[model samples]
Target: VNSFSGYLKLTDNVYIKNADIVEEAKKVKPTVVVNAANVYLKHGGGVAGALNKATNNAMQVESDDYIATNGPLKVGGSCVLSGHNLAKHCLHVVGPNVNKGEDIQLLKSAYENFNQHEVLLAPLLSAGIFGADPIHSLRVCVDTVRTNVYLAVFDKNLYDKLVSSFL
Candidate 1:
């Protein structure tokens, strides 16, 4: 089965392109979206920060308590959030502080562990403020997400590269 809305579908299971992540997310309205968060659930940078604001800090509070009760999530582990301002649910992934190969494992674990839904919307993880290569990060996102995945990207250059190869 396949479900997605975009010009670039790398496979029957993945969608990669340049678009407003928030809009795309609202369109698909996936069961859960991934929120890039830190150990403290600060959600104050890049996608995390944006999502926090979009949810009017609802996610921020939940995340803070989540971490407090559950302790800092492992690199690849994640926590879930109710529909505050985004998807019905949001999976919080602890973005790596360092852009090492280990971050790939964390990404994979986040996807693998999320059993709440088969459809997941994820950003170009660790590629932004984390300083990882967009291409490499995209590859990891594609390789993981065992279920259907939507890779919402806003980078023209990265979108161009993905489309050229996928086409």
Candidate 2:
């Protein structure tokens, strides 16, 4: 079991802390946690599912309303879940499906579209059920997110890779 990890400074305030994202989220109390989702706000699998469950489906209710009014959101579009259980807010970013190769640039757009916030926790965008390799997806996140970012990591191997490659 990995108990401790390291962090990197991307900017004056932006950081990449490799730790249990769910646990870290509690400590940070981030303004938002980016959850990969479709326009429907199903939160059916991966980190999205985990966040959905954590919030007692509050995220889905908010997302459903946004999508209903706006129609199906594009990859970069998102809806917000405010006053969530784990985070003050949750950002449901429309991510690419696992059926296609990961689109790093599109992932960049998604991060760019997020509302201004001091701290945000995000899983590897388009990874897991979306089928992007963990490292590749994380690289996109590191490259894209402009504010303070907490990357919730579960795998020690992936954590080590990030330290070696970026730190």
Q: lDDT of each model, Cα atoms only?
A: 0.70, 0.68
Candidate 1 on 1-167: residue-level lDDT in tens? 54465546687677776876677666767777877766678877688887788778888888778777877877766777785767888877765555544555565555565445687777876668767666766666666656777777767877888677553
TM-scores, all models, native as reference: 0.84, 0.79
lDDT of 2 by residue, 53-167 (tens): 7777877787788778878777767766673767677777876665665455676777675536666777767766777666776666666666666666667787678667763
RMSD of 1: 2.7
**Top of the candidates by TM-score:** 1
Model 2 global lDDT (CA atoms, 0 to 1): 0.68
Residue 86 C-alpha lDDT in model 1: 70
Model 2 error, position 91 (Å): 1.6
Off by over 4 Å in 1: 1-3, 99-105, 114-116, 165-167
